[PDB]
Structure formats: C-alpha cells, structure tokens
Amino acid sequence: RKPPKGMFLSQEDVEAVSANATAATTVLRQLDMELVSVKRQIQNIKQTNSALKEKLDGGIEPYRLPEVIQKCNARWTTEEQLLAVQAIRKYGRDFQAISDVIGNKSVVQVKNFFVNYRRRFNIDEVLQEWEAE
Amino acid sequence: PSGVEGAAFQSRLPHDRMTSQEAACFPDIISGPQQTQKVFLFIRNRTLQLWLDNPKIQLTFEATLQQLEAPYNSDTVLVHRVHSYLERHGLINFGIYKRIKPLPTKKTGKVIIIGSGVSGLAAARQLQSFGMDVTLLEARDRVGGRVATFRKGNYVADLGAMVVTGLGGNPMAVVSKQVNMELAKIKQKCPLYEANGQAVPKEKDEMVEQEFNRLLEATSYLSHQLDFNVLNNKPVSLGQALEVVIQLQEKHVKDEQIEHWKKIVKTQEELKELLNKMVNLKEKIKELHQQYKEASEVKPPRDITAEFLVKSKHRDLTALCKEYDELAETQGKLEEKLQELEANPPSDVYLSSRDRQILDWHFANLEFANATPLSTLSLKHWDQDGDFEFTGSHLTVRNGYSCVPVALAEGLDIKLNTAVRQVRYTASGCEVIAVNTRSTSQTFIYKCDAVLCTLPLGVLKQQPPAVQFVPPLPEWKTSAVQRMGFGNLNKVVLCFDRVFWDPSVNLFGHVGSTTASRGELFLFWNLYKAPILLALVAGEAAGIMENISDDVIVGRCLAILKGIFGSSAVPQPKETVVSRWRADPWARGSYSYVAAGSSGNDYDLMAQPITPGPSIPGAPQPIPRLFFAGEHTIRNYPATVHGALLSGLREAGRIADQFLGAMYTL
Ligand SMILES: Cc1cc2nc3c(=O)[nH]c(=O)nc-3n(C[C@H](O)[C@H](O)[C@H](O)COP(=O)(O)OP(=O)(O)OC[C@H]3O[C@@H](n4cnc5c(N)ncnc54)[C@H](O)[C@@H]3O)c2cc1C
C-alpha cells in the first residue's frame, strides 16, 4: 500500500523528524533559511541581469548592414579570383564565408575553384599560411 | 441482509460458519461432517430469527421445534442443544420478555453482583432467569450508573450515555423493541463557527475535514507500513503520529518551494550567462562596424586588397549580426519561461493559522469520541474495535436512556446506597463487605458462591484502592488495569424557554482559538423535544473544566452562543447541569480507551475470572469465584452500552455453566 494522495511520508524523513528532540523545528528551519538564501540569490541575478539588459538597449540596429541580393554566376572575373585567394588566406576552408565574400559564387563553385586553380594560385601554400594562425 | 442469514448478522454471528464458542460446545459437530454443520448453522440461525422476530415473549424449545421443518426437526437433541446454548449465552431470551414458564420456585447458588450498571443488570436478569439467587450492590442511590438521565419539569437530558450507534447487529435493537425508547435519528450535518462567531465557508469546511481524514489514513500508513510504533523505548501515540505526519507535510511544502525557486535561479543564471554573451558580441559588432565604415570610407577606384577588406568586414559583420539575432531569440524563450515559473508557485503554506484551528476542532471531536487526549491513544490500536461497528444511522433516546436500566432493574434484588469496600474470595466461597453510603459505620456482609465485579475501570484503578481484594488480584490482572486507559468527557445541559437555534440543525460546532483549548465547549446538540442545548467538553479541556464553577462554565457557553446567534437571541437558561465524571467516585471517568502500550488483548485479560488458591494445601483445584464484566471487559465493543449489556450476558452464561452445569456440551 501507499500513503493517501498528496501525503508524503518517506521512511528516511520519518526517521529524520523524530531522530532527536526538536529535530522537527531544526529540519523545518534549515529549509526556512535555505529558502530565504535562494530568494536573495534570485534578487542578485535579477538586478545583475537588469543592468546587462540595459546595456543592450537599442539592440544592434545602428550596426546593421543592408541585404546584398546577388545572383550566382559561372564566370570568374580576374577580380573575384583575387577576392577568392585573399578569402582563402583569411578563412581557409569556410567555403560559406568565402562564398559570402565573393558574393556571386555558390559554395560548390568555391569548392571547384580550389581544385581547378589549385596549381595556379599555389592554394596549398595559401592554406598552410592560414593554418599557421 | 435478510432471512435466517439476517438473524446471524443481526446477532453478530457469521451465518455460514461455526464460531469458536460454538466449537467448544459442539465439538462433535464442527469436527463432524460438513452436512451436519450446515444443519447446525441453519437450526441456530432459524432459532435466532424466531427470537428476533418477537423479542417480547420467551422462545421455548417446544416453540422452536414447532417452527422447524424436516430434515431439521428430525434430530431433537441437536435442536435442544442449540436452543439451550443460545439461551444460556443470552443470544435469545435476554432483556425484558414474558416468561412462558414462570421461574422455578427453588433457586440454586447465590451470586453477588457489584454494581447496578447495565452490565450488572443484564447479568442479574440472566442469572435470575436461570434460577439463581442474585443480589446487586450499588453505591449510588439509583440504577444505570454511567447511564444517567437528568429530569426536571419537562426537561429531559442524558448526562451519561445518549447514542445508539446503529441498529445493524446491535443488541439494543432488541431492547428497543422490548422497551419504549423514543428513538430519533441524528442528522449528521454539523456546521462550524470560528472564535468570532461566523460560520466556516463550505470550501474551508470541506477542505480541512478532508485533510483531517487524510491525516488519519496517514497515521495508519506509518503504523502498518513503516512500523512506526515504538520511539525511544516508549509506545507511539496517535497524537505523536499526527504531529509527525503534519510536520512532514509542512516539510514537503518547503522542499517544494525550494525546488521551484531553484528552478528559477538555475534558469535566471542561464539568462545571465547569455546576456554576457550578448553584451560582448554587441561590443565586437560595434567595433567591427566602425572598421567596415572606415574601410568603406576609402573611395574607389581601389586595389583589390582594399576591396577585399570592405567585403570581408561586411561578411564578418553580417555573420556576427546572425549570432546576436539567434541569441536574441534564445533570450525571448528564457524570459517567458521565467514568467511561467513566477506565475506557477507551489503552495505558500501547508495549513494557515485559521485552518489549523478548524483542524483542531476535528481533532477535538476525535478526542471527544475516544474520550481522551490523542496523546494517550495507542497509535496501532485506538480504533481496533471499529471493524465491529454496527450499520444504520446513529440515534438518540429522546425520552432519556434511564428508561433502559430502570426497565432491566424490575424484579431484581437491588441494594441501593450500598458501597462495596472489600471482596474476599476463597475455595469454599466469597464474602463481600459493604457499608451504607449515608452512614459509613453501618456495615453489611454478604456470603455467596460467586462475585461478579462490574466496578468501572476508573474505580479498579483507584489509588489508594476504593475496594480491597482478599486475596489481592493477581499481577496479570492489575497490570492490565494500569495499562488500559480510562478516559473522560463531560456534558453541560442548557435548558431554555425558547428555541433560538435552527430546529433543522441537530448539532453544531464552535472552533476554539488555541490547540490547548480545542475541546472546551467545542460542540452543541439540539436533540430533544424541549428547548435544550447540550454543550460538550472533550480532550485535555474536560479534566481542567471540572475545577470551574457551574456558573462560569454556563457563562462561557452563553458567550459562545451570543457569538453564533447574536447577543439578543440567547436568554438566560432556566435550568443548568454540568457533569464531572472524573470527579464522580462511583465511576472515576467516562469510559475506556486503548491507551498507548495497551492492546485489545488487555480487555480480554479483564474478563478472565479469578480462581482462588485451595483452602487446605494439597486439596484439589477450586472453582473460579471472582468474575468480571462491564465495558472494559468486552474487547470488540468497549466504551458502549451494548458492550456493557453484552459483557453482562456473557458472564451470566459463564457463571451458570460453572454453578448450574452445562447439559448441552454432550
Ligand atoms: C458522558 C458519557 C457518554 C456516554 N455515551 C455513550 C453513548 O452515547 N453510547 C454508548 O453506547 N455508550 C456511551 N457511554 C458508555 C456507557 O455509559 C457505559 O459503557 C456503560 O453504561 C457502562 O456499564 P457498566 O455496567 O460497565 O458500568 P457502570 O454503568 O458504571 O456500572 C457500574 C456500577 O457500579 C457502581 N459502583 C461503583 N463503585 C462501587 C462500589 N465501590 N460499590 C458498589 N457499587 C459501585 C456504579 O455506581 C455503577 O452503577 C458513555 C459514557 C459516558 C461517561
């Protein structure tokens, strides 16, 4: 059998509330102390977070850059070949970043680029440099 | 139940099974084949049915056999044995009936019965009914003892027993047919009225009550499932066990809040650590924007490394603006999750001070029923007799319960104002020494074969002793007396000239302001035809209230009633009476209870008769001389009138078996 519903009586707890004289008021005060100590610690983190909240006021709206609606393309302008080599130097293998920088190349076209021009732009060496930081 | 099976149930017997008692008288039958048992059981059940269907005339053996039909009328010795057994042990022809056969002219054996209580009277009638010489000694100037009824003018109010606790299997059912007891049911709806004098709301009342019953179930769980029955060598009380349960509920309420607020802070701390991530990312975003701005200030045409800067810093920034937006969305969830948590707090308290006072009333009512503070009741055993409770509504005796013992006393040699001082019992017989209560010098001596002691437990408990036993009662009997509990509760009778309460409300409560005074005037009954309100003192309060003037107690009652019914509506009472049962020397308290460290088994010890030592040494084992009855001997029906009645019937059977011989054992 179990206790009535919403009545809690663990073996362990019975022992603990009876064990000594006033173990009742002892255990019940430990929790009154514990509660107020958690209630105060709530106020700290509330007030701490209220300050951190206020710093972010404004969001990042003054720092937002408009949308570049760029159409993908097969051809590689000598321009964007050079943008690539430099992007490789700064980003290494983050083909997404390299694609975003160049603007008009899909992420696969970037991966292909690595392979086609690999020899002509010493792309090995270029990566060794990026890795070296 | 109905039929012959109804009679078995109505006589507290299992219809389909032979009792242990029956096995002793009919060992041939019960060891015998299954068929003969069923025959027996029918013959028995039928015979009871007959008696029950008309308890105002003696059921003879002839009459019984008359109504039997084959195969059951075939064996006439069985039918005679059964009838005799039943008759002997007061299952039939008990109480007040017309003797078909007038009593025998000559009596056999002399028995002295101490006390004209219902137990005493019941035995006396049976013993006399069996043709013995019976004489009862009553210290009081009236029969009934703890059945006491106040009468003045047309006011009639029981200061002693009042309730018939259901008729379903109650011997008093049979007695009510035999004696005009004006039996009115009790409408159990009892509204509570706090210290101020304002009724408790339905919501409150129902909540607290339900909690009270839940707390009780809880104590049972501690007792039976967790074996929480000893603590620091001492037995655990119901009182202790309720505290422990209540504390554990209070403790749980705190444990719950702790866990809820700990869920807040853990999540609040996630938010803290997130806001830091957001404020540092904003700082980088601020700086990076500036760099992109500066690099974009360099007007074209420009070489490709300068073009790469604008592009890379553009990408880098929209990349960081992505992060910050994802973190802004995460912040939104954790911020709303907070409001849910702060909106769904666990219960503030287990019980408030105002609930806890109402709960104390529900405890006071239990202290009232058991007639003792809950600190005294055995956790394991306080309710053991509760499996044998009768069915049906509880009723009051409208015309006063004294009608019953008075009816039983008719035709009995009762010596009133005769206080037993000493009981001597020896192999050869017993002498009982009493005095006249009015002049203590005037001394009486009664010689008899057997003594039946119906002295209240409170009297048996008295130190120094009111009654001396010679020889002294054996260790096993006296220890049982110490161990058992003799409780206390008192009634205050308020007789008015007008009804100012609700005539549809039978009973209503008052809620005391402290735990310490929960019992004090905690309940009022309107149960009588006349305009009388009865007020109850229970629990710890009862014993203390016995040291307070009647006038003061009536004051406190009126005060409370002014509160509930308005200061105008409560006149001065015409007549008032206040019981002080613990004070009363002829019953030192109200009735028994199962004290902590007692069990029902003590009630059985108290019934066990005493057999003296042999007069001449080496002479054979004597007959039992000193017998015991009264409530407090009857394990399964203690603290009741029916219990007393039943104990009386029992001892009469036992004594008659001893001194008149049992022909029916063969
Ligand atoms: C306030 C109150 C309310 C109660 N309400 C109920 C109820 O509602 N329902 C219910 O079923 N039961 C109730 N009871 C219990 C019931 O009254 C008893 O259980 C029953 O009457 C006891 O019968 P008895 O023969 O065992 O003892 P008693 O009735 O006390 O009889 C014992 C007799 O012995 C006499 N006596 C004592 N000392 C001596 C002496 N030294 N010499 C000679 N004689 C002596 C007494 O005066 C008494 O007449 C109530 C009891 C009380 C106090």
Side-chain angles (χ1 to χ4, degrees):
Chain A
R1 207 170 86 267
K2 292 181 169 180
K5 219 74 173 185
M7 214 97 310
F8 297 73
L9 324 153
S10 107
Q11 172 53 250
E12 180 191 329
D13 300 334
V14 181
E15 306 199 64
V17 173
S18 48
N20 67 95
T22 66
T25 28
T26 286
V27 169
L28 298 193
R29 275 212 201 87
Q30 245 69 316
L31 309 197
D32 285 27
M33 303 263 290
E34 261 273 9
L35 201 85
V36 70
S37 111
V38 172
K39 279 187 150 208
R40 88 169 68 251
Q41 190 187 352
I42 238 127
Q43 287 306 122
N44 261 247
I45 299 187
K46 270 188 77 172
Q47 208 149 309
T48 283
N49 286 19
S50 188
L52 301 191
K53 264 174 51 170
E54 205 188 336
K55 292 208 234 285
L56 310 202
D57 191 291
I60 60 166
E61 294 324 293
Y63 307 82
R64 219 123 184 170
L65 289 182
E67 276 271 24
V68 181
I69 308 100
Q70 190 57 283
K71 319 286 163 165
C72 270
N73 187 282
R75 211 149 302 259
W76 283 84
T77 21
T78 329
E79 172 180 17
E80 57 218 12
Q81 304 189 3
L82 294 163
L83 288 178
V85 164
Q86 294 190 88
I88 288 172
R89 184 55 186 75
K90 188 180 169 74
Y91 300 103
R93 299 191 166 75
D94 188 349
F95 307 148
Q96 184 48 42
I98 295 179
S99 172
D100 290 321
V101 163
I102 297 170
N104 78 11
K105 294 292 178 282
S106 75
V107 189
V108 66
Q109 288 169 309
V110 170
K111 304 210 301 182
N112 292 122
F113 182 92
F114 276 88
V115 183
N116 314 122
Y117 297 99
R118 203 258 261 203
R119 77 285 245 292
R120 280 165 285 172
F121 295 160
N122 307 38
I123 297 179
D124 288 14
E125 294 180 329
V126 181
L127 293 152
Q128 291 168 39
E129 299 282 4
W130 173 78
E131 280 161 6
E133 40 178 312
Chain B
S2 77
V4 299
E5 295 142 320
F9 158 92
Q10 175 54 41
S11 303
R12 309 153 295 285
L13 299 164
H15 70 88
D16 59 21
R17 216 176 63 267
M18 288 183 70
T19 78
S20 183
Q21 158 124 289
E22 290 170 347
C25 310
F26 302 84
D28 57 307
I29 293 177
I30 205 172
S31 78
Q34 276 291 328
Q35 186 42 47
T36 55
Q37 292 182 24
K38 292 197 185 182
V39 173
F40 167 80
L41 291 167
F42 183 96
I43 293 156
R44 182 248 273 169
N45 293 350
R46 187 67 183 101
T47 314
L48 291 129
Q49 176 168 55
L50 287 157
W51 158 252
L52 288 170
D53 293 335
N54 190 3
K56 270 209 261 54
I57 57 176
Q58 175 174 358
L59 183 73
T60 55
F61 164 57
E62 284 75 44
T64 304
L65 184 53
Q66 193 59 40
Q67 264 92 332
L68 278 159
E69 279 186 40
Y72 308 132
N73 56 221
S74 72
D75 193 354
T76 33
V77 295
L78 220 73
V79 179
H80 189 63
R81 275 171 78 201
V82 167
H83 179 272
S84 303
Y85 152 90
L86 296 166
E87 179 168 37
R88 175 47 65 85
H89 300 117
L91 290 174
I92 63 182
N93 311 305
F94 68 86
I96 307 137
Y97 45 105
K98 190 181 279 177
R99 348 266 91 179
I100 290 181
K101 314 187 176 170
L103 40 41
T105 52
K106 293 298 177 80
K107 302 189 176 296
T108 317
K110 166 65 175 203
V111 178
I112 279 299
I113 299 189
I114 300 176
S116 189
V118 173
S119 66
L121 295 148
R125 282 201 143 249
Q126 289 297 93
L127 291 172
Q128 195 188 65
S129 156
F130 309 148
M132 296 194 73
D133 191 330
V134 181
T135 293
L136 304 81
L137 313 183
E138 173 57 62
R140 294 181 205 277
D141 57 340
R142 47 167 214 79
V143 303
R146 284 173 272 178
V147 170
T149 303
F150 173 72
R151 288 150 190 289
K152 192 136 192 273
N154 310 301
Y155 302 140
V156 162
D158 266 277
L159 294 145
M162 187 165 70
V163 183
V164 183
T165 71
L167 311 163
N170 188 322
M172 305 305 291
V174 166
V175 175
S176 59
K177 296 142 184 265
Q178 290 177 4
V179 181
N180 178 33
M181 315 165 70
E182 297 196 33
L183 281 188
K185 297 182 194 192
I186 287 164
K187 290 176 280 179
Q188 300 298 345
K189 185 194 146 189
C190 179
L192 315 178
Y193 294 71
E194 296 163 74
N196 63 23
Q198 304 263 218
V200 173
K202 247 196 176 60
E203 271 215 321
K204 270 282 146 187
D205 203 329
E206 292 179 33
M207 185 281 292
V208 175
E209 183 166 336
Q210 202 201 347
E211 197 60 20
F212 165 66
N213 303 315
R214 291 158 49 74
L215 289 160
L216 274 165
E217 289 171 60
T219 50
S220 181
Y221 178 94
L222 269 75
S223 193
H224 297 109
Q225 309 311 122
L226 301 169
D227 204 279
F228 182 63
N229 300 302
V230 186
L231 193 64
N232 308 341
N233 298 104
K234 315 228 301 289
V236 178
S237 62
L238 181 62
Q240 284 173 230
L242 289 164
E243 275 168 325
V244 170
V245 170
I246 279 174
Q247 289 162 354
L248 267 38
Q249 296 329 282
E250 274 164 351
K251 185 237 191 170
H252 168 82
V253 164
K254 320 222 164 188
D255 283 337
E256 274 277 301
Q257 285 177 4
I258 281 173
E259 204 213 52
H260 167 260
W261 296 110
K262 276 193 173 173
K263 265 181 281 144
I264 290 187
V265 296
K266 159 169 168 171
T267 255
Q268 206 81 345
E269 214 151 283
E270 286 176 31
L271 197 72
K272 184 201 214 184
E273 206 199 45
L274 196 81
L275 304 209
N276 270 5
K277 187 173 250 59
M278 308 229 314
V279 82
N280 287 33
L281 203 71
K282 201 207 200 194
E283 219 55 25
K284 279 207 217 79
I285 282 171
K286 185 194 176 187
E287 176 186 337
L288 218 204
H289 175 78
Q290 184 50 35
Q291 293 177 27
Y292 163 90
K293 209 68 163 183
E294 288 178 355
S296 207
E297 307 302 89
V298 170
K299 291 272 90 78
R302 53 194 160 196
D303 82 62
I304 204 63
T305 71
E307 195 71 27
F308 175 62
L309 229 93
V310 177
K311 297 288 169 58
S312 89
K313 297 270 179 258
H314 178 91
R315 162 258 123 58
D316 283 358
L317 189 96
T318 44
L320 295 200
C321 288
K322 201 127 288 158
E323 279 187 45
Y324 186 92
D325 297 335
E326 295 187 14
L327 280 48
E329 202 160 54
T330 295
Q331 187 203 356
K333 301 189 318 193
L334 303 203
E335 277 196 321
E336 75 185 359
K337 165 180 285 197
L338 251 293
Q339 263 148 308
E340 170 182 32
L341 287 251
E342 290 161 323
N344 301 351
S347 286
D348 184 19
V349 295
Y350 173 49
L351 274 95
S352 93
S353 214
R354 203 160 153 287
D355 318 49
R356 182 65 227 271
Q357 289 161 325
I358 296 170
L359 186 68
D360 280 347
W361 185 96
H362 285 265
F363 293 140
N365 190 236
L366 192 66
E367 316 212 283
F368 157 75
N370 291 258
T372 193
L374 313 189
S375 31
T376 71
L377 292 161
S378 183
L379 169 62
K380 206 191 296 190
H381 300 291
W382 73 275
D383 68 329
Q384 59 98 43
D385 64 325
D387 290 347
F388 310 95
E389 289 167 5
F390 304 136
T391 73
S393 310
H394 289 203
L395 291 61
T396 77
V397 185
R398 210 94 176 284
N399 64 322
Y401 219 142
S402 74
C403 76
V404 168
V406 172
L408 297 174
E410 195 199 43
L412 286 185
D413 186 30
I414 295 165
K415 299 274 170 287
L416 298 156
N417 296 300
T418 321
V420 171
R421 279 269 238 272
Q422 177 174 127
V423 171
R424 324 179 106 257
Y425 54 100
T426 60
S428 41
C430 318
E431 41 185 315
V432 178
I433 307 132
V435 297
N436 191 36
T437 35
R438 295 160 291 174
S439 71
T440 97
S441 341
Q442 189 176 343
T443 284
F444 297 75
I445 291 210
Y446 298 84
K447 301 272 158 55
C448 60
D449 299 287
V451 184
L452 176 52
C453 175
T454 88
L455 291 169
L457 181 60
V459 180
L460 295 170
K461 293 192 138 218
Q462 259 201 236
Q463 227 58 33
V467 174
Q468 201 192 343
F469 289 92
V470 175
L473 289 170
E475 137 62 37
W476 60 266
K477 176 73 74 172
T478 49
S479 303
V481 174
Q482 283 178 49
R483 286 191 306 267
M484 283 177 76
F486 200 55
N488 188 31
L489 79 86
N490 287 303
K491 304 189 186 197
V492 185
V493 196
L494 306 164
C495 307
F496 296 118
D497 53 322
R498 65 265 272 171
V499 187
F500 62 74
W501 43 91
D502 197 341
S504 66
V505 84
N506 277 148
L507 53 151
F508 65 85
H510 152 270
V511 189
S513 62
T514 334
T515 305
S517 62
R518 65 197 184 185
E520 188 176 310
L521 305 162
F522 89 104
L523 172 61
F524 299 72
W525 324 82
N526 150 59
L527 292 162
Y528 291 119
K529 298 177 211 161
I532 304 164
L533 271 187
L534 231 65
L536 271 50
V537 193
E540 296 281 18
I544 296 164
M545 288 281 282
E546 288 194 18
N547 304 322
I548 290 181
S549 342
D550 291 311
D551 304 307
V552 183
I553 295 150
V554 176
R556 299 193 191 191
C557 284
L558 297 164
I560 290 165
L561 298 157
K562 291 173 195 311
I564 284 74
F565 294 99
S567 194
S568 314
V570 288
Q572 280 293 118
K574 301 314 193 169
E575 290 296 336
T576 60
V577 193
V578 172
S579 86
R580 329 207 344 290
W581 283 109
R582 189 72 78 191
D584 186 23
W586 315 124
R588 290 211 175 281
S590 60
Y591 49 76
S592 71
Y593 71 86
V594 198
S598 186
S599 56
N601 187 251
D602 285 350
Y603 288 80
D604 286 346
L605 292 172
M606 298 257 48
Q608 209 68 15
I610 316 300
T611 299
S615 280
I616 315 123
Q621 180 76 298
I623 299 97
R625 295 289 177 186
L626 180 58
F627 298 84
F628 290 99
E631 160 270 330
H632 87 254
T633 65
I634 198 161
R635 184 193 191 115
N636 291 9
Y637 302 82
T640 57
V641 169
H642 54 264
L645 184 293
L646 283 163
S647 62
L649 299 196
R650 179 195 68 221
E651 286 316 91
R654 167 144 49 194
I655 288 158
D657 286 338
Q658 188 60 256
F659 293 93
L660 313 186
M663 317 323 201
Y664 61 81
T665 317
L666 282 59

